[PDB]
Amino acid sequence: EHVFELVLPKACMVGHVDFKFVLNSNITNIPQIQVTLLKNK
């Protein structure tokens, strides 16, 4: 597991979050990783 905590400069009407990723070139199979978005306490 990895958790990225992301504080925005200001409150805003967030439309979406683009999570871009680059996998290792020597990747035999596409991994089974789930990515989800939550709000902080």
**What is the spatial distance between Cα 29 and Cα 11, in angstroms, rounded to a whole number?**
39
Q: How many CA atoms lie within 13 A of 21 on its CB side?
A: 9
Residue 21 has phi, psi (to 5 degrees) of: -140, 145
What sections of 1-41 are H helices per DSSP?
Answer: none
Q: Whole-angstrom distance between the N-terminal and C-terminal Cα of the chain?
A: 19
Method: cryo-EM
Which amino acid is it at 25?
A: S
Tokens of 19: 């999570």
DSSP state of 15: -
Task: Copy the structure tokens of residue 8.
Answer: 């925005």
**Cβ–Cβ under 8 Å, residues 17 and 37:** yes
Given resolution (angstroms): 2.1
| DSSP tag of 25 | S
